Design a protein around this ligand. Structure first.
Ligand SMILES: [Cl-]
Lengths: 190, 188
């Protein structure tokens, strides 16, 4: 009841503190400064920067999961697009979080908690993308093709865009990748 | 002269693949090299001076490799460039991890950003050149060569990222297929 309230306020502080300082220079302390409470009011829930950010990843996935539950369209063509929009147009307003997330991704081979977490995100996207592709194949709207490989392909495009958008400090990279995603999909499916 | 620098580039190659970028200092490189901390300082003042050099050392053995593809046949050349970008790096996976770490630093060091950006320029130039040639030759559809090219770059970059993040070099294999699926959907 009041455990969720603190977690959420703390996740928000985290977001804000990551937006300002990036991954490397994040500290519980700076998190705490953004939370407005004592440093020990965060150590009450998390013992480490790393524990805290594993939670923060889980948090971003839930936020993402929520917004998808918002899309109830079952039309395969319309739903693919809406998912692609969700993954490629919406993030054209989180660029400062984006630097932090690439730093953290580059650290996945040294930290299981992050690696586990990023695979989790990836699986969720994979599941929801393969699912709409399968539905359309079933409705006969899409050509009967290797669904696992088509969705792996869209996964690569997605991850391409996120890296190049930060690596090149250009959110246009997602906008071009959005187009790549449509071209790719249309060539395979329709 | 430039003989000694190469051995340092090669030392930081060993210490990179061992200890990682994050856990990398002059002392550790000095160790793989066999000479004193001062002796590497003779060639590089900052660790940043060293890493920048380090960077454009890789992106230099690489162009050395592409400037081996001598063919002007557009279909063949484009596949051979895509091979070199996606098929060869599979057998050389060790450095990919630190490669990603440097990339994540690009927003913090202009020296890094500058270099990946120039490298990216060059890869885009060489990919787009084939595509253009193939259009003139009439063997690829007249296409937005700038977009098709950067589309191929999105695929290549996602592959590099995904292969370390999900710890799976076959991630480059499926991207090679994606790239061929895309290119010839656009071009042919
Ligand atoms: Cl997401």
């Amino acid at each position: 009841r009041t455990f969720s309230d603190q977690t959420e306020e703390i996740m928000q502080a985290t977001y804000r503190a990551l937006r300002e300082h990036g991954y490397a220079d994040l500290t519980i302390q700076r998190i705490a400064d953004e939370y407005g409470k004592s440093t020990a009011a965060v150590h009450y829930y998390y013992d480490t920067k790393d524990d805290l950010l594993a939670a923060f990843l889980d948090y971003l996935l839930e936020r993402f999961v929520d917004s998808i539950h918002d899309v109830e369209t079952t039309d395969p063509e319309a739903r693919l697009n809406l998912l692609l929009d969700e993954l490629l147009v919406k993030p054209q307003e989180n660029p400062d979080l984006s630097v932090a997330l690439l730093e953290m991704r580059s650290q996945a081979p040294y930290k299981e908690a992050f690696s586990d977490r990023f695979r989790q995100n990836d699986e969720y996207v994979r599941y929801m993308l393969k699912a709409v592709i399968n539905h359309g194949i079933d409705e006969g709207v899409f050509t009967d093709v290797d669904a696992e490989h088509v969705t792996r392909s869209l996964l690569t495009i997605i991850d391409g865009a996120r890296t190049r958008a930060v690596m090149l400090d250009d959110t246009e990279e997602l906008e071009t990748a959005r187009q790549t995603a449509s071209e790719y999909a249309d060539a395979m499916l329709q």
